[PDB]
Write a protein that binds this ligand. Structure first.
Ligand code: ARG
Length: 238
């Protein structure tokens, strides 16, 4: 009993995983993966754009049926929703201006303005660890706003997924003067283990269909054909 049309929510301001092209078509690695999996599930799929923090609310209220949006699989989120198997890995890392002394440490960040996406694992981490101790942590409605304010000099740093900052900003014209500030911030408690399709806890049939399709496209080498369009390293981790 899978629906005829599976409605998939995503936030299109997180290139190279999810954004929109010049005509306003959805593009990116999350979109490619979702469409391949729908093709193997033999369902029809509609993509529904949303703000990142509205995705899990819309899922719970049945306005969409699945979330593919670099949604990290964390212990907190599993208390609310279910997840497919891992689609790819996702570490977190700070970016600041090139030459910045900034490190991902309280002592370095106290009194700085750090941008984080509202609803993200990074907002959770920064609020507990940094906002309480005097770092000016600013939550943003979407990631594009964060990159804008950083280049505007309104932010000193921004915490987001590492590959999104890399491919989506630092290797782009806009990010030429910026760089990663320190190594990735590892914290198992906050950042989870890779990303997956978020689904309602009771939609086990739909979880099984996505997992079967993900295993099939990984097995035959499709995942890697698709990943190579965007990455030259192994995005899956392993
Ligand atoms: N399309 C997006 N905005 N994705 C943001 C993902 C950020 C982080 N991985 C999280 O799960 O909270």
């Amino acid at each position: 009993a899978l629906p005829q049309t599976v409605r998939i929510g995503t936030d299109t301001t997180y290139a190279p995983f999810s954004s929109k092209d010049a005509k306003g078509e959805f593009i990116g690695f999350d979109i490619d993966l979702g469409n391949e999996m729908c093709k193997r599930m033999q369902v029809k799929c509609t993509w529904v754009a949303s703000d990142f923090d509205a995705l899990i609310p819309s899922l719970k209220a049945k306005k969409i049926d699945a979330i593919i949006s670099s949604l990290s699989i964390t212990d907190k989120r599993q208390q609310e929703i279910a997840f497919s198997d891992k689609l790819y890995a996702a570490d977190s890392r700070l970016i600041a201006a090139k030459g910045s002394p900034i490190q991902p440490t309280l002592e370095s960040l106290k009194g700085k303005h750090v941008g984080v996406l509202q609803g993200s694992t990074q907002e959770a981490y920064a609020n507990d660890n940094w906002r309480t101790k005097g770092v000016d942590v600013v939550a943003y409605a979407n990631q594009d706003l964060i990159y804008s304010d950083l280049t505007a000099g309104r932010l000193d740093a921004a915490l987001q997924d590492e590959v999104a900052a890399s491919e989506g900003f630092l290797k782009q014209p806009a990010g030429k003067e910026y760089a990663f500030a320190g190594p990735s911030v590892k914290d198992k408690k906050y950042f989870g283990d890779g990303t997956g399709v978020g689904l309602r806890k009771d939609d086990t049939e739909l979880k099984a269909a996505f997992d079967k399709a993900l295993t099939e496209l990984r097995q035959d080498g499709t995942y890697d054909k698709m990943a190579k369009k965007y990455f030259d390293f192994n995005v899956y981790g392993d």
